[PDB]
Design a protein around this nucleic acid. Structure first.
Ligand SMILES: Nc1ncnc2c1ncn2[C@H]1C[C@H](O)[C@@H](COP(=O)(O)OP(=O)(O)OP(=O)(O)O)O1
Ligand SMILES: [Ca+2]
Ligand SMILES: [Ca+2]
Ligand SMILES: [Fe+3]
Length: 1104
DNA sequence: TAACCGCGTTC
DNA sequence: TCTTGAACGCGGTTA
């Protein structure tokens, strides 16, 4: 019932109100005032001020029978206390009409059909970007159906779903039902709807008054919530995962606002623990006090009791939604405790643990979304070293439970290791970012942390659409089929970024390089030189040439250098290793071109036609064959007392899955292919006068990210003097903050392609990509002619320029100030603004009379990364091909500048290749000549080959397994890969066989394997031996080690007997080839490690 | 062979 | 239900 649901949500509400009272969040109703809610005199109006930390939807009773929708807001005050306060706002959505004439007619019919759920209805008007002449002022008439609570709203939709689907009777010559076109803004989440309409945001200060919340724009900083972070280490069966059903919590470490506490279960932890200290850097103090308890239930209850004592409004964990919280929850139930009644936490619809007064900050969600760290470096170990600057305590999870008996202090100091890292990781990186993000995104801390960047973008866009009175579009629904010249398509897409491998090998400042400069390109550069340094001064640095002392001097110094290189073109010199890269490329291409989904028109100036490249992946079959297989499927029966289902009876989508997978069979059996793919160049018109609310939202977020990037460089430019340890401290703060916004910023591009988007446009996303490829290839077309481009990717070109090429000069202003000039950079930027500027950008100057001014927009700019020391790019093993998206770059202080894509960086490759790649790359700095350098690298390669050919003799059996184990992660559970083979798959099966099916039950299983030599002549996937078998009982070992070798006579069990050493040697050989010997070949040096042979295509090209 | 896939990168 | 995109390397599969 609708009155039953409201009754259920009402006692949830009274429970929450009691938990909030317990934790200090009593509902405050402000003193009554009947005056002007004048905002300047804020300190006269009676009420209570507070920093807003949370907001949850609610249902509120009479203070009729059903409740009223509202939102509880959770504040911290100025007096060290807390309070909570409720706002009510009627849920609402809109009905649109085919004909504006009879709008009241459909308004009386809706008053009839929704009589038992509607509360009120208005006639309002919003701007529809779909509508004709909306730019001249026209608006859309809509009925605003208002409701008492969120249940009546969904109830009205359930009644209107008939009427809408119904319109999809004397035939010899309209009713009110058939004028309901669609319904709008029914989707909007309620607390989002309140936070938007009432302009309330978590993280701002408000004075709560009877007239509403008053933003107090005076307070400088946030308040200071009491923050608590906790980790739990529990018992574990050997070589098995931790199971809440069987195991029990050994200890719970935690920190509350800099003070640490460890609670221990003295029924598994042998002795008792003294209050010790763990501070791995001076800035991260950690004095812990231990609460030694007896049983678990005593441990679980010093925990629950300590939470109520401190009443924290933030609790942080690391992966606490998947492991820590559900473990504590289930072990309290077995001990007869309701965690909700004790703490207020309970799982939500996604199984994540949330409370009302207290945000649950799982940092694992931050590192995964916003850290800009590779997944290989997203464990808490790596996250501490990267972003906190020390090496935390580390302990083998197999030694964990026995060290509880044998060495309790060590396990105690690994437990507080994880807690100190978690608390300070939250306070330095997660807390400032999320709560600042909350001041602009209409969500509370829990959802700001966990929602996807696409969805964060939708929020920001929905505030904008609303505040400019723009009617929200409904969410996009995927076309269930599309057809291309009769062929059913699998994927409709566009050509994305351009990326080129051009040269491989070692390039280095100390070693000369041959260049062949195009004289005709120089001629161009000096022709455009005069206007290009005017550009560097006025548009790059935002000044005037009229104020610069030495414009002609710099203009002459470049001229002779360019002229010298024009006559003496074929030159052999040291190179300048540089990187050019467009700053926020795709956003700036959108803002420069006024690119937004509502701007894309279809034949119906103000018109900037731009091209994109459409790619379809259709089946080779004809359409006669498509209906043939559909008829085949219709005659056959499908499963679900009704487990018998017509083909027609199933949803149009699921049908497609069956048609598509049957069509892959017929195509893979009549046409020898599953997909034919085709590029089609298409053009679209982009209206330059359309409401730029989307473009302006991306412009505003771009500007927000740019400021953090500029502050980062400002401290980098201030790095000359603990100055070298405090200036470099923030380089990371600000870079993190700029990198955190990078993914959200670029999601404004991806958003227009996302499922369920409200502003879907493939045309828009394709136009951005094609423009970006045209720009990057224009830049390479010129760098070819004056240097050697090494590697190019979307918006970036690595290159060597002749040492003779003009680089850096400083303009001087009458002020005495200097302006930075990189002629390699400004020579491209000037070309970009010549060739890619939008001279059709129209913007309303006077809205009151609809008068637009037209002007020229170009925010596209390259940026120069740096004069570098060395760069090592690998080469493919196949002829002619290169390897894209991998390389290493070094700074002139020897330090590593960039490492991209190599197995060293990726999550769980074969460790041997990871340690090899960690070793050689720095060795590429040694030697005095190109060949002397390759000889230094070779010496490292032979040392590794020595390890492999010696069958790791001189290597301990503990490191030998660490070095030869590959670690692949199963994105699902083993059941879902049915009909697939992989080393990750079979090693997971063989592990379920060995240790039980209970370790095959959770997704994301880490599969650590060895490839065995036996069974010989078998595919590599059938020889993947899980690594824990060698840690097992000698009986259990020798059983499975032969069931997997298919050698029942097997007796020797030393790892060196089982391992297919020829297999790992071929892998090491491949890494030696691609990084070293084959690029060596391409730079004219004979193979530097003869023990790894060149391929026969390279052997043929030594004699030819 | 040529085609395609899963994972985790670089954009 | 909630859900940013495409390009690419590598080691495995398949017919
Ligand atoms: N996560 C991503 N999601 C969507 N598009 C991306 C993403 N990363 C990169 N791109 C797209 C849009 C980028 O503008 C473009 C080039 O990427 P990239 O050079 O790494 O960053 P950027 O140019 O956007 O900012 P910046 O160079 O200032 O750090 O490719
Ligand atoms: Ca842990
Ligand atoms: Ca860029
Ligand atoms: Fe137009």
């Amino acid at each position: 019932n609708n009155y039953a649901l409201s009754a259920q949500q009402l006692l949830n509400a009274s429970k929450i109100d009691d938990i909030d009272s317990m934790m200090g969040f009593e509902r405050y109703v402000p003193p009554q005032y009947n005056g002007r809610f004048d905002a300047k005199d804020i300190d006269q109006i009676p009420g209570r001020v507070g920093w807003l930390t949370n907001m949850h939807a609610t249902l509120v009773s009479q203070e009729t029978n059903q409740g009223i929708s509202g939102v509880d807001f959770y504040f911290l005050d100025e007096e060290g206390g807390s309070f909570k306060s409720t706002v009510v706002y009627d849920p609402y959505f809109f009905i649109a009409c085919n004909d504006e004439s009879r709008v009241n007619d459909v308004e009386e019919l809706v008053k009839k059909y929704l009589e038992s759920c509607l509360k009120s209805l208005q006639i309002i008007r919003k701007e529809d970007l779909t509508m004709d002449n909306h730019l001249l002022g026209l608006q859309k008439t809509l009925i605003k159906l208002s409701f008492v609570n969120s249940n009546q709203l969904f109830e009205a939709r359930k009644l209107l779903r008939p009427i809408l689907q119904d319109n999809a009777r004397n035939i010899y010559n309209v009713d009110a039902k058939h004028l309901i076109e669609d319904i709008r803004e029914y989707d909007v989440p309620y607390h989002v709807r309140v936070s938007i309409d009432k302009d309330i945001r978590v993280g701002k200060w408000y004075k709560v008054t009877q007239q509403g919340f008053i933003e107090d724009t005076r307070k400088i900083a946030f308040a200071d919530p009491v923050v608590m972070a906790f980790d739990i280490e529990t018992t574990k069966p050997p070589l098995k995962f931790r199971d809440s059903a069987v195991d029990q919590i050994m200890m719970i470490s935690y920190m509350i606002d800099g003070e640490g506490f460890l609670i221990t279960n003295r029924e598994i932890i042998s002795e008792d623990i003294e209050d010790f200290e763990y501070t791995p850097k001076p800035e991260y103090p950690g004095f812990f006090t231990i609460f030694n308890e007896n049983d678990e239930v005593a441990l679980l209850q010093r925990f629950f009791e300590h939470i109520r004592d401190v009443r924290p409004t933030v609790i942080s964990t690391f992966n606490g939604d998947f492991f820590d919280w559900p473990f504590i929850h289930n072990r309290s139930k077995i001990h007869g405790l309701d965690m909700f009644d004790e703490i207020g936490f309970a799982p939500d619809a996604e199984g994540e643990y949330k409370s009302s007064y207290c945000s649950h900050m799982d940092c694992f969600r931050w590192v995964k979304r916003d850290s800009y760290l590779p997944q290989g470096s997203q464990g808490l170990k790596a996250v501490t070293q990267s972003k906190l600057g020390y090496n935390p305590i580390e302990l083998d999870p197999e030694l964990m439970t026995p060290y509880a008996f044998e060495k309790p202090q060590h396990l105690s100091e690994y437990s507080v290791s994880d807690a100190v890292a978690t608390y300070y990781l939250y306070m330095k990186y997660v807390h400032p970012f999320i709560f600042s993000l909350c001041t602009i995104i209409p969500l509370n801390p829990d959802e700001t942390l966990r929602k996807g960047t696409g969805t964060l973008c939708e929020m920001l866009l929905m505030v904008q659409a609303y505040q400019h009175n723009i009617l929200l579009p409904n969410k996009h629904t995927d076309p269930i089929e599309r057809f291309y010249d009769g062929h059913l398509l699998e994927s409709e897409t566009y050509v994305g970024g351009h990326v080129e491998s051009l040269e491989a090998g070692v390039f280095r400042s100390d070693l000369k390089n041959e260049f062949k400069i195009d004289p005709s390109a120089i001629d161009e550069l000096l022709q455009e030189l005069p206007e290009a340094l005017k550009f560097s001064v006025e548009v790059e640095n935002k000044s005037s040439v009229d104020k610069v002392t030495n414009f002609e001097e710099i203009k002459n110094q470049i001229t002779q250098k360019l002229l010298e290189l024009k006559e003496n073109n074929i030159r052999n010199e040291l190179p300048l290793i540089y990187h050019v890269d467009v700053a926020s490329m795709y956003p700036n291409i959108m803002t420069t071109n006024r690119l937004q989904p509502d701007s894309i028109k279809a034949e119906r100036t103000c018109a900037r036609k731009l091209k994109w490249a459409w790619r379809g992946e259709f089946f080779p079959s004809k359409m006669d064959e498509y209906n043939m297989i559909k008829r085949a499927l219709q005659n056959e029966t499908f499963p679900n007392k009704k487990k018998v289902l017509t083909f027609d009876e199933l949803s149009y989508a699921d049908q497609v899955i069956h048609i598509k997978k049957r069509l892959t069979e017929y195509s893979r059996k009549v046409y020898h292919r599953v997909k034919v793919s085709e590029i089609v160049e298409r053009e679209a018109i982009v209206c330059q006068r359309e409401n730029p609310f989307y473009v302006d939202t991306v412009k505003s977020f771009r500007d927000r990210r740019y400021e953090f990037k500029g502050l980062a460089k400002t401290w980098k430019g201030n790095l000359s003097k603990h100055a070298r340890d405090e200036a470099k401290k923030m380089i990371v703060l600000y870079d993190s903050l700029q990198l955190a916004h990078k993914v959200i910023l670029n999601s404004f591009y991806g958003y227009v392609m996302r499922k369920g988007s409200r502003w879907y446009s493939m045309e828009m996303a394709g136009i951005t990509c094609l423009t970006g490829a045209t720009i990057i290839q224009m830049a390479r077309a010129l760098v070819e002619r004056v240097g050697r481009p090494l590697e190019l990717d979307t918006d970036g070109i690595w290159c060597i320029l002749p040492k003779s090429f003009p680089e850096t000069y400083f303009f001087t202003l009458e002020n005495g100030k200097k302006l930075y000039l990189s002629y390699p950079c400004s020579m491209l930027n000037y070309r970009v603004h010549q060739k890619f500027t939008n001279h059709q950008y129209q913007e309303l100057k006077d809205p009151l009379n609809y008068i637009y001014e037209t002007h020229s927009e170009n925010t596209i700019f390259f940026e120069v990364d740096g004069p570098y020391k060395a760069m090592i790019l690998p080469s493919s093993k196949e002829e002619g091909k290169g390897i894209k998206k991998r390389y290493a770059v070094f700074n002139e202080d020897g330090s590593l500048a960039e490492l991209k894509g190599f197995e060293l960086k990726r999550r769980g490759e074969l460790q041997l290749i990871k340690n090899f790649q960690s070793d050689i790359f720095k060795v590429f700095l040694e030697g005095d000549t190109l060949e002397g350098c390759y000889s230094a690298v070779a010496s490292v390669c032979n040392r590794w080959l020595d390890v492999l050919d010696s069958h790791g003799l001189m290597l301990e059996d503990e490191d030998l397994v660490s070095l030869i184990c590959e670690n692949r992660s199963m994105s699902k559970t083993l059941k879902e890969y049915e009909g697939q083979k992989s080393t990750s798959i079979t090693t997971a099966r063989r592990l379920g066989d060995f240790l039980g099916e209970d370790m095959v039950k959770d997704k994301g299983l880490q599969c650590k394997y060895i490839i065995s030599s036996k069974p010989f002549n078998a595919p590599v996937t059938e020889r993947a031996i899980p690594v824990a078998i060698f840690s097992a009982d000698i009986p259990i070992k020798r059983s499975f080690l032969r069931r997997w070798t298919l050698d029942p006579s097997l007796e020797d069990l030393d790892i060196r007997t089982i391992i297919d050493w020829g297999y790992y040697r071929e892998r090491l050989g491949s890494a030696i080839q691609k990084i070293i010997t084959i690029p060596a070949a391409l730079q004219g040096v004979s193979n530097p490690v003869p023990r790894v042979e060149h391929p026969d295509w390279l052997k043929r090209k030594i004699a030819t």
